[PDB]
């Protein structure tokens, strides 16, 4: 099948620019389990010319992986070789032979954006008094917008943009991650999937949910939901609404209401990302500019 060809090709290939000796990698605690597999903290000796040990993260298959999970791992590997941007998680290498496949990536010290925002709720007296300033939250959104503009410029649809898939690294810098589901879109400008997708329902654009069409403009939809997560410090979208109810809810034009601690200007941006007609939504270059207007 397609996967056996991919596995067979990937094994035959050498790729010295990315192979890393397994003996030079030491794995540590688990940082979390996502889709495709788990992530652990690790340290790497003599990595990409860096003398001594470097702290890294390691993406590997989970126990009892399926073909779909193995395909996502290889698909994330292949995508990460092609991208290089300050707000996109960085690949350092991989371990293929004499053991299970490991992807070595930049370590993000603060973890996922969602967890970082939820943890910030515990700082201070209570919900009516936050520890992150609105200006800090806008900066995060802007940083992510810049990374998406870059990914769109090279014809990649991320498909899975959400706070759980954004990493916060040294200096509170945003790093887009979780590229297992992203798809190259150079030829046609869209990606279509016949099967039911594995993106959470509550982040999917209405044309991806009904018609299975993914484009840069459905990425903008998800970015609109991401803005909602950020502004709510990691809230859960469409609270109390079962995912199965979203089909009818979105079809009839309903959208999430303006949340607490959200300016009217920021809400106008959210709603524009959720327009039913994809071409009526802004492009990421315009989202960046609109976020800049909110900066002081
Ligand atoms: N480079 C990384 N650095 C730190 N934590 C990560 C990294 N990649 C994934 N994770 C963690 O694993 C999960 C995403 O796979 C999240 O819980 C996140 O905290």
Residue numbers in the entry: 700 to 825, 841 to 1010
How do the authors describe this structure?
To explore the impact of S904F on the overall RET conformation, the crystal structure of auto-phosphorylated RET kinase domain was determined at 2.3 Å and refined to a working R-value of 19.8% (R-free 23.7%), with good model geometry. Residues 820–825 are ordered first time compared with previously published RET kinase domain structures. The nucleotide pocket is occupied by an adenosine moiety. Only small differences in side chain positioning are observed close to the F904 residue. F904 side chain makes Van der Waals contacts with V906, I927 and the aliphatic portion of E902, thereby defining a small hydrophobic core absent from wild type RET. This may tether the activation loop more tightly in both non-phospho- and phospho-RET forms, enhancing the basal level of RET activity. The results showed that the S904F mutant had a higher affinity for ATP (Km[ATP]), resulting in an increased catalytic efficiency (kcat/Km[ATP]). An even more dramatic difference was observed for the S904F mutant, which showed accelerated and enhanced autophosphorylation kinetics compared with those of the wild-type protein. To validate the results of the cell-based assay, an in vitro kinase assay was performed using purified RET kinase polypeptides, which showed that the IC50 of vandetanib was higher in the S904F mutant (908.5 nM) than in the wild-type kinase (67.82 nM). The co-crystal structure of RET kinase in complex with vandetanib indicates that the mutated residue (F904) does not directly interfere with vandetanib binding because of its location.
